[PDB]
């Protein structure tokens, strides 16, 4: 039915099948002189998925002159048989790590700095992001969040939003502003921290 | 959408040509190709064309068949000369998604297409 892909800017697709039991995923890079694969194993019961990877977490395997064709392959018997196919350019279909290596850098009774990295993706992508910020406070769903969205090549926040003395958890998101079928990454962790005391 | 035509009934050493009327978008973005499905067989791969004007053919009609596009015209073709028995089939055109794919040998693969035509019969006398 539905065949997705994506790639986290340096050596990993990660691929997505949904079809209405033993398959594959093979990778062809054109003009390369590797190919792989990957088997695809359950991750709901409507979907299977698997990660091709590519080289070393921080290794730069594609540029943009790269196309992979991406195959889905299962087993009809003896015969491996085609049931999903795409030409597949890699940095039209970005979807970074989710932020890592979230702290407080410094918490007030209504303000709080976060900071943030980036990471497995070159320092050109830094420099051509999108973030998404959102906040859970006691009484309230991560749905029910204030939302906070922005363009900037700065890996921190000072969040203005918040109530003295207060229990918090933070979460943030990336996506690169290029690509035709660039999504957001997953969610960070969640950071905890609590506000300080009105003086 | 995509709408067959051309095809009918030659006989053998003939040459016949397959039009096939599709949007403005896809005759000039996406992936094309043309398919056959003869009796008791699957649907096979005759003939491909990429954005890029690309073409690849299945090895039993190489030299003989020739896929091409009209961008003024929003048509497809596929020119077929030195028909053979082995011809006699239904004949597909088929338009890929925008962007998922840039090759004509992918443009090859029967798995490459959600969007069919309601094909053409084409018989060659022996």
């Known amino acids: 039915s539905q065949f997705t892909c994506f790639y986290n800017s340096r050596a990993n697709i990660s691929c997505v099948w949904s079809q209405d039991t033993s398959c594959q995923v093979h990778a062809w890079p054109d003009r390369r002189r590797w190919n792989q694969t990957c088997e695809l194993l359950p991750v709901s019961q409507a979907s299977w998925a698997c990660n091709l990877i590519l080289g070393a977490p921080d290794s730069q395997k594609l540029t943009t002159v790269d196309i992979v064709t991406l195959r889905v392959l299962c087993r009809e018997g003896v015969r491996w048989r085609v049931m999903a196919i795409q030409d597949f350019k890699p940095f039209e279909n970005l979807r970074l790590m989710a932020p890592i290596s979230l702290q407080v850098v410094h918490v007030e009774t209504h303000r709080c700095n976060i900071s943030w990295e980036i990471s497995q993706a070159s320092h050109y992508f830094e420099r051509h992001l999108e973030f998404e910020a959102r906040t859970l406070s006691p009484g309230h769903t991560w749905e029910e969040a204030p939302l906070l969205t922005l363009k900037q090549k700065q890996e921190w926040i000072c969040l203005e939003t918040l109530t003295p003395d207060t229990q918090y958890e933070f979460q943030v998101r990336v996506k690169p502003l290029q690509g035709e079928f660039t999504t957001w990454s997953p969610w960070s962790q969640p950071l905890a921290f609590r506000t300080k005391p009105a003086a | 959408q995509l709408q067959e035509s051309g095809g009918g009934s030659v006989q053998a050493g003939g040459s016949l040509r397959l039009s096939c009327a599709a949007s403005?978008?896809?005759?000039?973005?996406?992936?094309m190709g043309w398919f056959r499905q003869a009796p008791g067989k699957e649907r096979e791969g005759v003939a491909g064309?990429?954005?890029?004007?690309?073409?690849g053919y299945g090895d039993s009609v190489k030299g003989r068949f020739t896929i091409s596009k009209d961008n003024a015209k929003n048509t497809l073709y596929l020119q077929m000369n030195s028909l053979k028995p082995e011809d006699t089939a239904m004949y597909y055109c088929?338009?890929?998604?925008?962007?998922?794919?840039?090759?004509?040998?992918?443009?090859?693969?029967?798995?490459?297409?959600?969007?069919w035509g309601q094909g053409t019969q084409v018989t060659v006398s022996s």
């Open positions: 088929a338009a890929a998604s925008p962007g998922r794919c840039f090759l004509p040998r992918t443009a090859l693969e029967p798995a490459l297409y959600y969007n």
């Open positions: 064309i990429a954005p890029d004007g690309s073409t």
């Open positions: 403005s978008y896809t005759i000039s973005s996406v992936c």
